[PDB]
Amino acid sequence: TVDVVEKVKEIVAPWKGKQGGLIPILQEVQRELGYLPEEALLTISRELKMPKAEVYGVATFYAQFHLKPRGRHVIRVCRGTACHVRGSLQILEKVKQMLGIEENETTDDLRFTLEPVACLGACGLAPVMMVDEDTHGRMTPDKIQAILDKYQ
Amino acid sequence: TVDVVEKVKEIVAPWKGKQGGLIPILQEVQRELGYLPEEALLTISRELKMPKAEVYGVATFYAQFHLKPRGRHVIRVCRGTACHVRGSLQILEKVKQMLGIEENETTDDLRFTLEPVACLGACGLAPVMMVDEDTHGRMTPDKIQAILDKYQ
Amino acid sequence: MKEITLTIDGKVCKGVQGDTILDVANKNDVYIPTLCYQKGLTPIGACRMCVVQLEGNPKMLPSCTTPAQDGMVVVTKNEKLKDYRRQILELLFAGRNHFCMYCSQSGDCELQRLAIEHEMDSVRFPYLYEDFEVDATDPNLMMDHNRCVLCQRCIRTCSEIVGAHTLDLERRGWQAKVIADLGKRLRESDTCVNCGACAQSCPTGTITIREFAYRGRRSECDAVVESVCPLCAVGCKIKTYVRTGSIVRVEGTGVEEPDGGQLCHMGRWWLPESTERERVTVPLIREGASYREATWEEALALASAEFKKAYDQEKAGAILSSLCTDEELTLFSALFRNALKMKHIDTFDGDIIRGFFKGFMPFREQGVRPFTAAHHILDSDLIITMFADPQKEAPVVASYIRVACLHRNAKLMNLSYGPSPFPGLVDLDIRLPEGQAVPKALSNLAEIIGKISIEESARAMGLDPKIAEEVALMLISARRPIFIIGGRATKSHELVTAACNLAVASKAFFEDGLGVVPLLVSANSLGARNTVVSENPWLGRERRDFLYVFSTAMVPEEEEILAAISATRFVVVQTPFKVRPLVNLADILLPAPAWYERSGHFCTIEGERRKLNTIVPPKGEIKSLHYVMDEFAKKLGVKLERPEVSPCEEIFKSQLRASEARIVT
Ligand code: SF4
Ligand code: SF4
Ligand code: SF4
Ligand code: SF4
Ligand code: FES
Ligand code: FES
Ligand code: FES
């Protein structure tokens, strides 16, 4: 509990008295802590003297911020136009029914997390199912097990 | 929740109508599930028609049963006579203050668990600090970090 | 040409150049369906219902946001616009769960008025029956989110008008919900000043005042009386709705004034709740622990016998209310200050008024107005709350402070011995210890103006020297600072002069005068001073065997004054209600006109006279208040001689601007 009060109070120091900078001030506490706890946003609102409602609105308005602890291995499937026309939706729904967890949430013990992203760039090797480390070019319906057990 | 009701109701089948066998009937649900949930003991008491109080008493009387989910990597330090005269207590207390968790409990997110055991056999290479896979012969005060970060 | 001429629905319209089409529309007569335009709040373009078409241009543009350009043909009503507006209303009804059968606002809802106007006999779009939370944790406001059109008129009225920026939007797209701080409940919120301006801005019955639900509807009102809140000095303008002899809803007019209709809790929640109090309407008598009904002759006899046996030996006083009009206070002066010449008459806040008007008086000698209007703390750069808690003294001043220090880049610095009134909004906190800290502050300000030292004044003030120099630096660096004098600054009247003199020091001059803006607890402050306020404090520190206390039982009364009243041995209260802190310390308990059955004028510290209007007429017959004063004058050896209301001539006049000197004490 005390580990989350000065790390956030120190990353705000180079922004005091400067207009703007809540989008970056959070992208840093996200990269450090993995997520944005309520204590984090509370101290950001205290230090910047910005309203807590505004901080929570910006923290929940953008996709790449996670207010709850994200997993230790993200399972970003590509729901881009190229993957979807190829049938990535099938891969997404099977990783859904396989981890048994809801669409955009973490496992019960913080091991995996499903995060449907935009194009990861491999719009040639479609569909791509990145498992937090590297691309995965083909990912037919049967090749999802041989990776989800490996990275855990 | 339904995953823990038939696995325990099937391991009890070869013991029905046979006197004894609650120590083994549990060592099997421990090896399978990693721990003994309250549902497990409840179904054992239902199937064997043994009192729930007796089942909980046997489950909490012996050390190698864990009623709560044990971690994914045990950190068994040896508090045997040979290790203790060598000074294993120092290693135990530093893994204590390093994981910050209590003496015989699991981490907050089920990664590690400290389980002071009896002689693991390497009473020559003392003290031994097994990290759920292999022995560790010397384990001076400084060599505890280079393994606890590796296995996580 | 500023005056542009357009054509809305054939009707020719006239407007200023920068005005939007909705402004030139609402200016002449014509009606355009709107749901998210609150007169005041900057046009937010969310509902897309005000869409109008320009001739020739085949597309449609919002009338709230698109400006009027020098001559053009706007069509507001036709088939395609009606179709699109009906589709928008139906989308709102299908997305959120709208059940009008049980809504507090079924008759006021602006989504319901529009739906009935566009003949919405259906929903057309599939009903998404999703579960939006009903936040009724707050005992005063309830937020039933399944009626929320998402117009942000509640975020905007709590961001730009109240300042305590409690409400904002939560997520994006469809999941967008209006939330309090960190997505918590309104009760759990630390930053809600419980104002209700969110309930006056919500068109769609999401936010409702709970206590007056189903009664405070504007469609079922018997009358609508405009007046002034009498609880504090800000004197907010109100539009009280009357339904069968009780006020059911108090919405604040003045959406064009700097305040913006954000009446406080005491005005949107104590004014309608006071029209439903016990209302004695018969002269009582103590009898021991429980009152008995007496006649007016009997009660005034038992209250005048105790006023003659206690006036020969001096032993007599009067604690009138400063929420009373100048007519009533002039009547009380006719009996008490002139007929029987009591020098023990006070006004239930006489310490505050006499401290303020004995600290400001030096500058009246020097010939300046040592106070300005509170709406000038909105454009200031550094706000200094000296001994003030504006949330409990004049909450619109606190809202101005918040809007300034959040949406207009100001800084807050407190010089109080208290809880730092804005805990998390001040940049430098000072906690001046008790004792005698006024002439050392005088020395400090004499420095701050003459040098442009603090070492001796710091230890003299009982303060650390580093922070005492930081105070001077941030005080000189400001380009238009303002000071907020508190009521607690008036226990020693020289502290108020120290405050005003610090304002002269920090180059804080405004067109009205000095930037100190005193937080008067009462509205009729100058009226009370000229008629009742005693030049010496007597309450508590003097016995006062008899005490006629007039208490329009509205504002929470200082508890020291109540104790002093409880040790009096005969207390004649003329309170209108039977509220708790007055029926305990009372022996007679006569009735009164109760603030809404009388009219008055309320001359204030800032000069000009206001007007309180008779909202609902009296029900019973107290038959006068002059009758009580006459029956006191009778069998006491004194007369009455009703005088005229003393013309309030603003004793503090601004014959000097940006040219004052400090005052030695
Ligand atoms: S908010 Fe208005 S439209 Fe919605 S249910 Fe209530 S009265 Fe009807
Ligand atoms: S009560 Fe006042 S401060 Fe609170 S949310 Fe409503 S408008 Fe904002
Ligand atoms: S709560 Fe009311 S005022 Fe606020 S956005 Fe919703 S509908 Fe508009
Ligand atoms: S701030 Fe004062 S004048 Fe305004 S509504 Fe509240 S009590 Fe009335
Ligand atoms: S299409 Fe999925 S990677 Fe761009
Ligand atoms: S002494 Fe520790 S291994 Fe036997
Ligand atoms: S009414 Fe013009 S957009 Fe809301």
Tab-separated table of C-alpha atoms in Angstrom, chain C residues 282-563:
chain	number	residue	atom	x	y	z
C	282	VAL	CA	-50.706	30.458	19.133
C	283	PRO	CA	-48.915	32.065	22.118
C	284	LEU	CA	-47.533	29.318	24.341
C	285	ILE	CA	-46.144	29.352	27.936
C	286	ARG	CA	-43.461	26.982	29.471
C	287	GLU	CA	-45.321	25.340	32.489
C	288	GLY	CA	-42.249	23.096	32.944
C	289	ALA	CA	-40.885	20.878	30.127
C	290	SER	CA	-43.977	21.159	27.887
C	291	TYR	CA	-45.786	24.193	26.506
C	292	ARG	CA	-49.438	25.035	27.078
C	293	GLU	CA	-51.707	27.032	24.785
C	294	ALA	CA	-52.282	30.553	26.099
C	295	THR	CA	-54.156	33.570	24.828
C	296	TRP	CA	-52.360	36.652	23.531
C	297	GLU	CA	-53.507	38.736	26.510
C	298	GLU	CA	-52.329	36.107	29.020
C	299	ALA	CA	-48.984	35.490	27.302
C	300	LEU	CA	-48.173	39.160	26.734
C	301	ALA	CA	-49.151	39.891	30.345
C	302	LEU	CA	-46.850	37.167	31.697
C	303	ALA	CA	-44.134	38.378	29.302
C	304	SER	CA	-44.519	42.065	30.198
C	305	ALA	CA	-44.708	41.514	33.968
C	306	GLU	CA	-41.315	39.834	33.577
C	307	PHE	CA	-40.234	42.822	31.435
C	308	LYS	CA	-41.120	45.408	34.066
C	309	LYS	CA	-39.613	43.655	37.099
C	310	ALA	CA	-36.435	43.288	34.997
C	311	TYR	CA	-36.237	46.770	33.444
C	312	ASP	CA	-36.137	48.843	36.668
C	313	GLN	CA	-32.923	47.120	37.576
C	314	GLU	CA	-31.363	47.174	34.072
C	315	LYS	CA	-31.357	43.379	33.496
C	316	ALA	CA	-32.960	43.241	30.047
C	317	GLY	CA	-31.832	42.562	26.521
C	318	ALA	CA	-32.861	41.628	23.002
C	319	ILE	CA	-31.331	39.295	20.435
C	320	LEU	CA	-33.075	40.001	17.160
C	321	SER	CA	-32.369	38.200	13.906
C	322	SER	CA	-30.334	39.659	11.086
C	323	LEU	CA	-32.376	37.622	8.622
C	324	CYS	CA	-35.227	40.023	9.412
C	325	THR	CA	-36.175	42.810	7.026
C	326	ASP	CA	-35.385	46.445	7.704
C	327	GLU	CA	-39.076	47.108	8.473
C	328	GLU	CA	-39.094	44.581	11.334
C	329	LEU	CA	-35.696	45.712	12.620
C	330	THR	CA	-36.809	49.352	12.495
C	331	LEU	CA	-39.888	48.333	14.534
C	332	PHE	CA	-37.665	46.585	17.069
C	333	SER	CA	-35.445	49.668	17.231
C	334	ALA	CA	-38.556	51.772	17.829
C	335	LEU	CA	-39.363	49.728	20.903
C	336	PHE	CA	-35.941	48.725	22.189
C	337	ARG	CA	-33.411	51.360	21.136
C	338	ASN	CA	-35.661	54.424	21.438
C	339	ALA	CA	-38.750	53.862	23.624
C	340	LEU	CA	-37.139	52.042	26.554
C	341	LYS	CA	-33.528	52.887	25.545
C	342	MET	CA	-31.943	49.468	26.134
C	343	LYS	CA	-28.233	49.417	25.359
C	344	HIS	CA	-28.314	45.605	25.420
C	345	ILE	CA	-29.831	44.907	21.992
C	346	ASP	CA	-28.020	42.547	19.612
C	347	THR	CA	-28.622	40.660	16.384
C	348	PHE	CA	-27.595	36.954	16.927
C	349	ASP	CA	-24.406	37.620	14.905
C	350	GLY	CA	-23.476	40.990	16.437
C	351	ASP	CA	-19.877	39.921	17.001
C	352	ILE	CA	-19.358	39.349	13.260
C	353	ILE	CA	-21.138	42.540	12.131
C	354	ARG	CA	-19.482	44.780	14.729
C	355	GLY	CA	-16.044	43.264	14.084
C	356	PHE	CA	-16.470	43.806	10.348
C	357	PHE	CA	-17.762	47.369	10.729
C	358	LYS	CA	-15.104	48.277	13.297
C	359	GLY	CA	-12.287	46.857	11.206
C	360	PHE	CA	-13.489	48.433	7.976
C	361	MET	CA	-14.140	51.801	9.671
C	362	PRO	CA	-10.490	53.198	9.360
C	363	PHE	CA	-10.826	53.074	5.602
C	364	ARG	CA	-14.200	54.826	5.846
C	365	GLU	CA	-12.287	57.603	7.592
C	366	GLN	CA	-9.673	57.593	4.816
C	367	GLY	CA	-12.440	57.694	2.222
C	368	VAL	CA	-12.486	54.408	0.303
C	369	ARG	CA	-14.814	51.392	-0.048
C	370	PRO	CA	-12.937	48.592	1.772
C	371	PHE	CA	-14.800	45.721	0.016
C	372	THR	CA	-15.716	44.602	-3.500
C	373	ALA	CA	-18.230	42.203	-5.046
C	374	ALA	CA	-17.591	38.461	-4.825
C	375	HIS	CA	-17.968	37.948	-8.594
C	376	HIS	CA	-14.533	39.581	-8.973
C	377	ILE	CA	-12.835	36.568	-7.395
C	378	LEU	CA	-13.532	34.745	-10.662
C	379	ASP	CA	-10.936	36.674	-12.695
C	380	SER	CA	-8.335	37.012	-9.926
C	381	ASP	CA	-4.964	35.255	-9.976
C	382	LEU	CA	-4.305	34.448	-6.309
C	383	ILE	CA	-7.055	33.972	-3.709
C	384	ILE	CA	-6.218	34.327	-0.004
C	385	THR	CA	-8.776	32.938	2.463
C	386	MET	CA	-7.990	34.659	5.766
C	387	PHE	CA	-9.826	32.962	8.671
C	388	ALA	CA	-12.596	31.839	6.319
C	389	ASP	CA	-14.576	28.674	5.675
C	390	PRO	CA	-16.678	29.886	2.705
C	391	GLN	CA	-18.521	26.560	2.417
C	392	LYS	CA	-20.335	27.344	5.683
C	393	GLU	CA	-20.493	31.128	5.312
C	394	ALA	CA	-21.373	31.990	1.682
C	395	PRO	CA	-21.094	28.898	-0.573
C	396	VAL	CA	-21.362	30.827	-3.863
C	397	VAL	CA	-18.130	32.596	-2.845
C	398	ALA	CA	-16.608	29.135	-2.339
C	399	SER	CA	-17.880	28.080	-5.762
C	400	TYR	CA	-16.344	31.184	-7.332
C	401	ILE	CA	-13.076	30.285	-5.567
C	402	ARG	CA	-13.238	26.742	-6.952
C	403	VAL	CA	-14.062	27.794	-10.536
C	404	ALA	CA	-11.181	30.298	-10.384
C	405	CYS	CA	-8.605	27.913	-8.930
C	406	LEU	CA	-9.527	25.050	-11.283
C	407	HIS	CA	-10.815	26.341	-14.628
C	408	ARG	CA	-9.117	29.753	-14.567
C	409	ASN	CA	-5.611	28.997	-13.172
C	410	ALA	CA	-5.492	30.650	-9.764
C	411	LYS	CA	-3.667	29.751	-6.553
C	412	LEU	CA	-5.012	29.424	-3.018
C	413	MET	CA	-3.213	30.323	0.211
C	414	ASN	CA	-4.873	30.245	3.632
C	415	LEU	CA	-4.027	32.326	6.705
C	416	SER	CA	-6.411	30.625	9.133
C	417	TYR	CA	-6.060	28.726	12.394
C	418	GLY	CA	-8.257	25.927	11.154
C	419	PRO	CA	-8.829	22.943	8.913
C	420	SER	CA	-7.598	24.494	5.594
C	421	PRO	CA	-11.121	25.086	4.073
C	422	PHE	CA	-10.204	23.650	0.649
C	423	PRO	CA	-8.104	20.641	1.768
C	424	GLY	CA	-6.241	19.760	-1.404
C	425	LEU	CA	-6.708	22.990	-3.299
C	426	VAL	CA	-4.398	25.357	-1.394
C	427	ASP	CA	-0.756	25.514	-2.458
C	428	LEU	CA	0.717	27.018	0.723
C	429	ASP	CA	-0.849	26.323	4.118
C	430	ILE	CA	-0.360	28.666	7.082
C	431	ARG	CA	-1.686	27.932	10.579
C	432	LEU	CA	-1.255	31.177	12.516
C	433	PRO	CA	-1.362	30.407	16.267
C	434	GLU	CA	-3.765	32.159	18.628
C	435	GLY	CA	-3.068	35.215	20.745
C	436	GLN	CA	-2.334	38.637	19.252
C	437	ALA	CA	-1.276	38.220	15.596
C	438	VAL	CA	-2.759	41.399	14.047
C	439	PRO	CA	-0.112	44.237	14.353
C	440	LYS	CA	2.678	41.878	13.369
C	441	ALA	CA	0.671	41.116	10.225
C	442	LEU	CA	0.392	44.927	9.930
C	443	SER	CA	4.199	45.130	9.980
C	444	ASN	CA	4.380	42.295	7.413
C	445	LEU	CA	2.105	44.080	4.955
C	446	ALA	CA	3.831	47.447	5.568
C	447	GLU	CA	6.957	45.606	4.445
C	448	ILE	CA	5.254	43.999	1.394
C	449	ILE	CA	4.179	47.439	0.124
C	450	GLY	CA	7.129	49.607	1.247
C	451	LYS	CA	10.072	47.296	0.541
C	452	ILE	CA	8.635	46.992	-2.998
C	453	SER	CA	12.223	42.532	7.959
C	454	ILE	CA	10.026	39.396	7.739
C	455	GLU	CA	12.550	37.662	10.060
C	456	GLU	CA	11.273	39.393	13.194
C	457	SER	CA	7.609	39.384	12.124
C	458	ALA	CA	7.826	35.606	11.560
C	459	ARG	CA	8.827	34.672	15.129
C	460	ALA	CA	6.610	37.556	16.227
C	461	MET	CA	3.645	35.953	14.388
C	462	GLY	CA	4.624	32.631	15.984
C	463	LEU	CA	5.474	31.292	12.522
C	464	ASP	CA	8.492	29.701	10.854
C	465	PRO	CA	10.511	32.273	8.822
C	466	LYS	CA	10.945	30.347	5.519
C	467	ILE	CA	7.211	29.917	4.928
C	468	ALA	CA	6.670	33.516	6.117
C	469	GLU	CA	8.930	34.726	3.297
C	470	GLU	CA	7.271	32.395	0.747
C	471	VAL	CA	3.986	34.092	1.730
C	472	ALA	CA	5.436	37.503	0.842
C	473	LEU	CA	6.917	36.254	-2.463
C	474	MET	CA	3.686	34.669	-3.692
C	475	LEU	CA	1.794	37.745	-2.469
C	476	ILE	CA	3.903	40.233	-4.436
C	477	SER	CA	4.195	38.094	-7.595
C	478	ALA	CA	0.404	38.047	-8.109
C	479	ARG	CA	-0.954	40.476	-10.698
C	480	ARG	CA	-4.533	40.745	-9.347
C	481	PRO	CA	-4.894	38.858	-6.034
C	482	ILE	CA	-7.971	38.920	-3.849
C	483	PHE	CA	-8.523	38.310	-0.159
C	484	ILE	CA	-11.471	36.474	1.415
C	485	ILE	CA	-12.057	37.772	4.936
C	486	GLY	CA	-13.725	35.242	7.214
C	487	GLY	CA	-16.246	35.624	9.978
C	488	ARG	CA	-13.773	34.118	12.438
C	489	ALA	CA	-11.500	37.084	11.574
C	490	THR	CA	-14.019	39.316	13.420
C	491	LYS	CA	-13.612	38.079	17.004
C	492	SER	CA	-10.840	40.684	17.225
C	493	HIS	CA	-11.937	43.558	14.958
C	494	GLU	CA	-8.336	44.641	14.308
C	495	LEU	CA	-7.626	41.393	12.432
C	496	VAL	CA	-10.094	42.555	9.773
C	497	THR	CA	-8.149	45.805	9.398
C	498	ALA	CA	-4.950	43.736	9.142
C	499	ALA	CA	-6.629	41.792	6.329
C	500	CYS	CA	-7.795	44.960	4.517
C	501	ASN	CA	-4.355	46.471	4.983
C	502	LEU	CA	-2.765	43.368	3.467
C	503	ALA	CA	-5.087	43.955	0.524
C	504	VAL	CA	-3.765	47.511	0.168
C	505	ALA	CA	-0.254	46.043	0.411
C	506	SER	CA	-0.662	43.387	-2.286
C	507	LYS	CA	-1.819	45.960	-4.923
C	508	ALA	CA	-5.308	44.395	-4.887
C	509	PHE	CA	-7.537	47.154	-6.252
C	510	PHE	CA	-10.850	46.667	-8.042
C	511	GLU	CA	-13.244	49.231	-9.523
C	512	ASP	CA	-15.533	48.960	-6.484
C	513	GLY	CA	-12.663	49.162	-3.998
C	514	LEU	CA	-10.398	46.843	-2.045
C	515	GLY	CA	-10.310	43.111	-2.711
C	516	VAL	CA	-11.305	41.703	0.675
C	517	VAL	CA	-14.969	40.567	0.039
C	518	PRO	CA	-16.142	40.063	3.631
C	519	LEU	CA	-18.001	36.862	4.322
C	520	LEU	CA	-21.026	38.243	6.112
C	521	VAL	CA	-23.043	35.464	7.710
C	522	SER	CA	-26.261	37.479	7.330
C	523	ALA	CA	-27.933	39.310	4.427
C	524	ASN	CA	-29.313	42.378	6.310
C	525	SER	CA	-25.880	43.377	7.711
C	526	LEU	CA	-25.864	47.202	7.269
C	527	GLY	CA	-29.601	47.231	8.142
C	528	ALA	CA	-28.842	45.379	11.408
C	529	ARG	CA	-25.859	47.690	12.200
C	530	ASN	CA	-27.877	50.935	11.756
C	531	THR	CA	-30.836	49.597	13.815
C	532	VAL	CA	-29.906	46.785	16.288
C	533	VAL	CA	-26.132	45.912	16.437
C	534	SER	CA	-24.699	47.135	19.770
C	535	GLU	CA	-21.265	48.747	19.781
C	536	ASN	CA	-20.265	46.574	22.766
C	537	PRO	CA	-20.581	42.793	23.180
C	538	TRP	CA	-22.858	41.972	26.100
C	539	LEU	CA	-24.121	38.448	25.423
C	540	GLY	CA	-22.601	35.817	27.684
C	541	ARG	CA	-20.453	38.191	29.715
C	542	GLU	CA	-23.503	39.934	31.280
C	543	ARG	CA	-26.379	38.412	33.242
C	544	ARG	CA	-29.459	39.776	31.370
C	545	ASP	CA	-32.357	38.489	33.514
C	546	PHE	CA	-34.763	39.070	30.587
C	547	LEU	CA	-34.121	38.405	26.915
C	548	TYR	CA	-36.506	38.854	24.010
C	549	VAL	CA	-34.879	36.847	21.235
C	550	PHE	CA	-36.349	36.987	17.736
C	551	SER	CA	-35.185	33.992	15.720
C	552	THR	CA	-36.316	33.344	12.188
C	553	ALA	CA	-35.153	29.794	12.791
C	554	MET	CA	-33.358	29.287	9.495
C	555	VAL	CA	-29.564	29.487	9.858
C	556	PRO	CA	-27.744	27.318	12.425
C	557	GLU	CA	-27.258	29.579	15.422
C	558	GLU	CA	-23.862	30.084	17.092
C	559	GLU	CA	-23.896	27.703	20.032
C	560	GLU	CA	-22.269	30.243	22.411
C	561	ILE	CA	-25.177	32.641	21.876
C	562	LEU	CA	-27.644	29.761	22.555
C	563	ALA	CA	-25.951	28.928	25.909
